Amino acid sequence: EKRTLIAVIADEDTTTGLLLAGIGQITPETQEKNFFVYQEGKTTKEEITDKFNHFTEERDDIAILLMNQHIAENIRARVDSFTNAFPAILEI
Numbered sequence: 811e812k813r814t815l816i817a818v819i820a821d822e823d824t825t826t827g828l829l830l831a832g833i834g835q836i837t838p839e840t841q842e843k844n845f846f847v848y849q850e851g852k853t854t855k856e857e858i859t860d861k862f863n864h865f866t867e868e869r870d871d872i873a874i875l876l877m878n879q880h881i882a883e884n885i886r887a888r889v890d891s892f893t894n895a896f897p898a899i900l901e902i
Contacts, residue, residue, distance in 0.1 A: 813873040813896050817865040818845035819858065820878050824902065828876065842869070848881045858885050865897070872897040 818825060818834035825847050828834050834845030846861040847853075862885060865875050879901040882889045889899060 811873075813871060815844060815871050815873060817869070817872045817875045817897065818877070819848060819861055819865070819881055820845065820876065820902075821848050821850070821881065824878055833876070837871070840871075844872075848878070848884075855884060859888055862888060862892075866892060866894070874898050874900060876900055876902055878902060 815837060816833050818828050820828060820834075825834065825845055828845065834843070836843055844865075846865075848858065858881065862875075865872055873896065875897045877889075877899065882899070882901045892899060
């Protein structure tokens with residue numbers, strides 16, 4: 811389909827491992843980034859929510875949004891209210 815890419819909302823260590831596996835890297839043709847780093851005490855709930863809606867409603871090439879469970883817990887009502895077919899949200 812059109813939806814081929816994985817997006818990432820993840821703490822520092824998970825992002826590091828994902829970027830080593832090539833996940834969340836820049837899409838060559840569009841130059842878009844496919845990751846946002848959560849930093850406890852720095853990132854607000856509003857920024858997490860904004861990045862969520864971006865990867866989820868403002869991008870159209872995302873098949874799967876990966877997030878740490880604890881980050882999904884921080885915005886659980888926004889996550890539980892997501893209803894679209896795509897992307898699939900997987901909590902890691």
